[PDB]
Design a binder for this molecule. Structure first.
Ligand SMILES: C[C@H]1CCC[C@H](C[C@H]2Cc3cc(O)cc(O)c3C(=O)O2)O1
Ligand SMILES: C[C@H]1CCC[C@H](C[C@H]2Cc3cc(O)cc(O)c3C(=O)O2)O1
Ligand SMILES: N[C@@H](CCCC[NH3+])C(=O)O
Ligand SMILES: N[C@@H](CCCC[NH3+])C(=O)O
Lengths: 482, 465
């Protein structure tokens, strides 16, 4: 196996030591493989256009020997394949047909100048009069009985060669971001960009990355959310602000977590969160119907191999749930609406239900995670979070101890977080400040923030759902696996 | 100051059981669509059968009739407060002392057009959605951009342009069959251009990582794996420090095309930049003022193809009036490369000396977009060697108004890549083979500098340093 790489490195080095270049500079591609197949489709069985010369290029996936005149190569380019039929009668070169095809192995990248033809068996093909080896493949490719686990992630290029469904997998993701962007842009949004390095890295409930910026003699935090900036932009007269971009969080690596992930956040003035619900429903529905043709798609937690199947249904309207009602019915207890008390801290802690620093907000997050969240397979709205875990959401017009935040869960994971933005410069902040605050932001609020609805979504996670991948590493080209 | 008094009034209103910051005001139509809708209305007519609800920030207040100039989006609309149409308990006196300039207000009112032709809305009710607790005015505008956007509403136009620029680029490459992808911004060993990287720590892996200084190597691996045309627009992190053309964090656009040489990327860059310039402005030839407060000198950048092509050796040999040695890696050529008498002037090696010489003598001649071609192999490790002139690379740079905005080359196709520098997972990927390919990259912030006609990169950036 290694000796085969040694062997071909010998052949390539002796080819370069005889004055020949194994890695050429420029090959002219006359027609695209796709454009080739769509064209010459009118070909007949065993016809060859010898008066027409086309130049096509690609990677050799398989080599089939006929033991003489004919040698068959299956050429993969982009998403299509074309059979280059090497016939000795059509070879026009001062390379002997025998020695030449010892030079081209499987995996090698070749250009081809040849005649469009369709063989007697009907195979659409190009018959080269000349073959130029564009790149040698110095390694041994798997025999299609192989090509998995950890290796696929570390060496993505190989995975894309052997498993084209990864390629379709990512194409779908890019077409997704294209769709979302063309949607928001159709809604009058303006895509902008915010600093990824801040003095305080506001604002989200995670741990940030710390780096050092040399010019200023000071340390900076990588952004955990574009929020505070987008809101300041809303203050300045931009009514609809929109940003798709990455976010850096220091939380450990998981199947649903990556330290750096793509987040889409947008802020819309003169709307409450009840508007954003009727937006998220619309968007997710039309996106699902856009991609798969139907509103109801399957998801497999196991990995598409006889595991329990969740039947994700994106038809509007998604069911609505409260935190207090659902947790009260699940646990069978009565809670206090405003719970900033230590005496109230004993109550949440007392009702552990053996689920797992203990504060009211961390306990509540844990209680919700354990009891309410795993029930969510079909998309579900989770409404009315406390103010202790939602500092930047405006207070509820009715319940004194709740906020207008809502989350959206699909297959037991949170892909969307939104709220009605707090325009009040009297903002009470977290006392303990443990693992979870900008002076210039409150002063931006003093100039005034219109009634606003902020919204955010994990892009990689929606890609996970619509890709049917149990691991986030499958929708990321180069994940954090190490 | 004035903030103490208004926070006093708002808080004293807060202690009487009133909500100073309402939750939802239902806006019927945006101001733009309003003026566009009722521009055809007759004059001296007031429409009583139509009730519209528009909201915005009050730019100015002038006091029977009280005049508000309401700024929404990129348009303003005249709110005409008449006491005869007030439908409230207050009766027009107490109420309009509560709303000052800078306040964000909603308005439910009647479309009307005065005899003078001025289009206006007459509110029957005014709901103050947010108070402005500070006093609006008559270098810190980079620190506080929200106030800049409030006082100078036209600044938005620059950033809108940037968006409509990137969108254009996105619509261009997507028409060519390109696939927008995204690559990790954190690497153990950040490959790419020549700069200093950021060092950060990742706790889960308990290791030090480098922020990406270029999407280069990753995109090249993506091309290896069968993706023929790749492109990534995204932010990039360099530790070199702040300047007028430099910001530590800037937006870069790169694309890679298999089966293309660098002359194809030149004949493309010409095409794209031409069509985009004609798209934004009215002609291929635009103005530029490198002195912002001032007005002289005025460059006359011309985007009409074909841009001038220049070599490093020919142009620097003619400009300096001496003949250089051929492309030699050796120590001997560096002694010639000093040129202390020329006083062009850190560690000085043949590559850094050559770069400073280009920077002083050759580069300032570039006003119209100019291709600067054939850099040595000592300054271009990832560019393939020149097919004709040895010891040279197929790299080229593009300069406009004496600054570098795009860099492209024919990617090094040989896994015998000599990366030795004096003062891995990538090379093993090249062994599986990289088709003959052409890479391309561009600073987005700098093309925004040109097309916004700003001498400062902070003027095309929302929150600079
Ligand atoms: C932009 C945010 C908004 C809230 C939902 C979702 C949460 C986000 C949290 C998060 C943290 C982390 O360390 C790694 C990750 O992959 C994610 C994620 O995908 O989802 O995305
Ligand atoms: C990807 C490259 C290609 C060439 C133009 C442009 C150069 C780039 C260099 C650069 C270095 C730096 O430390 C700070 C900056 O703002 C820039 C920049 O904007 O432009 O982007
Ligand atoms: N920082 C939030 C996402 C943005 C929410 C804005 N409404 C989170 O991840 O929890
Ligand atoms: N490393 C390049 C950017 C990538 C160019 C690839 N053609 C630079 O000088 O910034």
């Amino acid at each position: 196996p290694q000796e085969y790489f040694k062997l071909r490195t010998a052949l390539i080095n002796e080819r370069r030591s005889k004055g020949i270049n194994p890695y050429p500079h420029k090959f002219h591609v006359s027609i695209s493989l796709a454009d080739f197949i769509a064209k010459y489709n009118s070909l007949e069985k065993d016809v060859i256009l010898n008066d027409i010369v086309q130049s096509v290029a690609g990677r050799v996936f398989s080599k089939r020997e006929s033991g003489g005149k004919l040698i068959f190569y299956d050429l993969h380019g982009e998403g299509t394949r074309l059979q280059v039929l090497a016939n000795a009668r059509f070879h026009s070169g001062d390379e002997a047909f025998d020695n030449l095809h010892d030079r081209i192995k499987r995996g090698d990248i070749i250009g081809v100048n040849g005649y469009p033809a369709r063989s007697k068996s009907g195979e659409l093909s190009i018959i080269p009069y000349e073959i130029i080896q564009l790149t040698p493949c110095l390694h041994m490719l798997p025999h299609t009985h192989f090509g998995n686990q950890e290796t696929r992630y570390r060496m993505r290029y190989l995975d894309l060669i052997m498993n084209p469904d990864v390629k379709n997998r990512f194409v779908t993701r890019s077409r997704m971001i294209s769709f979302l962007r063309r949607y928001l842009d159709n809604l009058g949004f303006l895509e902008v960009e915010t600093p990824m390095m801040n003095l305080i890295a506001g604002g989200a409930t995670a741990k940030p990355f710390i780096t050092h910026h040399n010019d200023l003699d000071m340390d900076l935090y990588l952004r955990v959310a574009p929020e505070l900036y987008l809101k300041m932009l809303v203050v300045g007269g931009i009514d609809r602000v929109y940003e798709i971009g990455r976010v850096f969080r220091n939380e450990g690596i998981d199947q649903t977590h990556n330290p750096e992930f793509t987040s889409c956040e947008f802020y819309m003035a003169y709307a409450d969160y009840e508007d954003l619900m009727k937006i998220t429903e619309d968007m997710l529905a039309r996106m699902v119907y856009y991609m798969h043709g139907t509103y109801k798609i399957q998801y497999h937690p196991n990995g598409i191999v006889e595991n329990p199947v969740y039947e994700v249904d994106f038809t509007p309207p998604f069911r609505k749930v409260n935190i207090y009602d659902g947790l009260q019915e699940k646990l069978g207890i009565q809670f206090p609406p405003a719970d900033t008390l230590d005496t109230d801290e004993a109550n949440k802690f007392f009702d552990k239900l053996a689920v797992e620093p203990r504060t009211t907000a961390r306990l509540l997050d844990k209680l919700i995670g354990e009891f309410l969240e795993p029930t969510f397979i079909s998309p579900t709205f989770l409404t009315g979070h406390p103010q202790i875990m939602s500092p930047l959401a405006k207070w509820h017009r009715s319940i004194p101890g709740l906020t207008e935040r809502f989350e959206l869960f699909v297959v037991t994971k949170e892909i969307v977080n939104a709220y009605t933005e707090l325009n009040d410069p009297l903002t009470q902040r977290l006392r303990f400040d443990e693992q979870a605050i900008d002076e210039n932001y409150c002063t931006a609020l003093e100039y005034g923030l219109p009634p606003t609805a902020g919204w955010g979504m994990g892009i990689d996670r929606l890609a996970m759902i619509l890709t049917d991948s149990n691991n986030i590493k499958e929708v990321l080209f180069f994940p954090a696996m190490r």
